[PDB]
């Protein structure tokens, strides 16, 4: 009750973040880093997924806030070779490239060196490690294209 000393003993919403029914890119301070993206690029989907899972688990164990864990569309490229004694490049093979992205934030300036050293030492063979700053350009590129919007913009031009 309001007049009793045991007032507000059942409060729970102050212990829980607001239940909201895109996202501003946080920028780190002088001793912190902003929202970063680690997009491992590999020709082996299994290796890429395994290393992304390892990075996510390592960040969770090291108490680094992982904003997201997703993947970029697979890039399919036909590799052709010129035939011997001929002038036609036949289809030698077809390769697929995958890009597993882990979006993290709150990396400390001092611990950044250690984290980068660990994730570059644990990098498997055939996998390229690429750590960059999260950008609205990348966020929009994650989405599809809108040819109708492009045509309307060209008409406006």
């Amino acid at each position: 009750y309001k007049t009793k000393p045991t007032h507000g003993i059942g409060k729970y919403k102050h212990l829980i973040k607001a239940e909201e029914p895109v996202r501003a890119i946080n920028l780190g301070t002088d001793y912190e880093y902003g929202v970063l993206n680690i997009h491992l690029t590999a020709y082996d989907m299994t290796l890429a997924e395994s290393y992304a899972q390892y990075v996510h688990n390592l960040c969770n164990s090291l108490s680094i806030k992982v904003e997201e864990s997703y993947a970029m569309p697979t890039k399919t490229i036909e590799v052709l070779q010129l035939q011997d004694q001929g002038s036609k490049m036949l289809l030698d093979s077809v390769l697929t490239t995958h890009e597993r992205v882990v979006q993290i934030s709150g990396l400390s300036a001092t611990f950044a060196e250690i984290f980068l050293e660990i994730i570059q030492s644990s990098l498997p063979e055939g996998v390229r490690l690429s750590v960059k700053e999260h950008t609205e350009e990348d966020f929009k590129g994650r989405f599809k294209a809108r040819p109708e919007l492009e045509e309307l913009l060209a008409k406006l031009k």
Partner: protein, 137 residues
């Protein structure tokens, strides 16, 4: 009209500025364990145990039994560790445990229980049945 709390209110030590940073009860089992611990802990406000919980004399119950026996803890621990190591080294035990086909000798278990933990369990059962309440007050 407001009245200050008699003692420390619940959840008064959890910092609210680092709400995101603090670890959460991701398991209902951990939440239930912490809730049971908190319920067991005494509180200054009115509680269920105040009205329904059994009320006993604050004085400790006077022991009228035999003096406790003396067992070499270090030697007992060493012997038990050696026995467990031998049991685990036995390959048949490992495969039985892995295939979920092993069992225990009930007679040996009961004999060892009688030798080691039997008197205490019997005392607890007698206290539950209220023999000491009636026989020895």
């Amino acid at each position: 009209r407001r009245t200050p709390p008699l003692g420390p209110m619940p959840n008064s030590d959890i910092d609210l500025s680092n709400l995101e940073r603090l670890e959460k009860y991701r398991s209902f089992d951990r939440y239930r364990r912490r809730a049971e611990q908190e319920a067991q802990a005494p509180h200054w406000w009115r509680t269920y145990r105040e009205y329904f919980g059994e009320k006993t004399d604050p004085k400790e119950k006077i022991d009228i039994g035999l003096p406790p026996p003396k067992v070499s803890r270090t030697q007992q621990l060493l012997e038990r560790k050696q026995a467990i190591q031998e049991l685990r080294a036995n390959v048949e035990e490992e495969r039985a445990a892995r295939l979920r086909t092993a069992s225990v000798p009930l007679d040996a278990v009961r004999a060892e229980w009688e030798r080691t933990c039997g008197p205490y369990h019997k005392q607890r059962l007698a206290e539950y049945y209220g023999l000491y309440r009636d026989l020895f007050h």
